[PDB]
């Protein structure tokens, strides 16, 4: 599964993601963090405890980047394993998304 821990203080909100983000769990992640993109406040997502991630995980991440930009917010990811950064780089997402 997956464990998504959202903490919102003074619109400086930090998500901690732990577990596997696959086709099964990426909808759950999107459902949890889309209301966070709507207020579009500065959010930081910690993938320290992500054990696996796939293109479906990248998909929810790009969907949230666009939605955060539309409402005037920010998106930071940190910190990612050297292997997770490679996963983002190969997809040509390392340049667009913050890390």
């Amino acid at each position: 599964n997956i464990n998504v821990d959202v903490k919102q203080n003074e619109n400086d909100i930090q998500v901690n993601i732990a577990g596997e983000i696959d086709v099964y769990s990426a909808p759950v992640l999107r459902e949890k963090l889309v209301p966070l993109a709507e207020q579009g406040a500065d959010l930081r997502i910690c993938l320290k405890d992500v054990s696996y991630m796939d293109s479906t995980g990248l998909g929810v991440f790009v969907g949230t980047f666009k939605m955060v930009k539309k409402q005037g917010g920010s998106l930071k990811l940190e910190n990612l394993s050297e292997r997770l950064i490679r996963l983002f780089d190969i997809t040509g997402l390392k340049d667009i998304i913050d890390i």
Partner: protein, 105 residues
């Protein structure tokens, strides 16, 4: 030697495949990085199958364990990109789709 699995075209069962593959991967003797790439590729093929059979399923996966290479076959745009770059050889055919990839030791 061949291993065969059949799972409902459901997202929950996608995890099962990575898990089994992981065992099959470590026993034959791949790096940590190789086994992690293998999980990405096989899981993408299975995602494609579930998302296809979505409209109308069952998914078959067969691991072929050879001396030099592991051959994965999954049957019923970013993901195919990952499959293609993370594996040593990828083939696709219709028909739905049957995706074949091999990764060498």
């Amino acid at each position: 030697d061949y291993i065969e699995m059949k799972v409902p075209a459901q997202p929950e069962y996608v995890g099962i495949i990575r898990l089994t593959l992981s065992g099959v991967a470590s026993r034959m003797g791949y790096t940590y990085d190789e086994i992690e790439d293998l999980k990405i590729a096989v899981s993408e093929a299975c995602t494609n199958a579930v998302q296809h059979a979505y409209k109308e399923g069952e998914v078959s996966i067969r691991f072929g364990v050879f001396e030099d290479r592991l051959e994965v076959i999954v049957a019923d745009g970013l993901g195919l990109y990952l499959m293609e770059t993370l594996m040593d050889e990828v083939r696709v055919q219709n028909h739905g789709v049957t995706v074949a990839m091999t990764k060498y030791l």
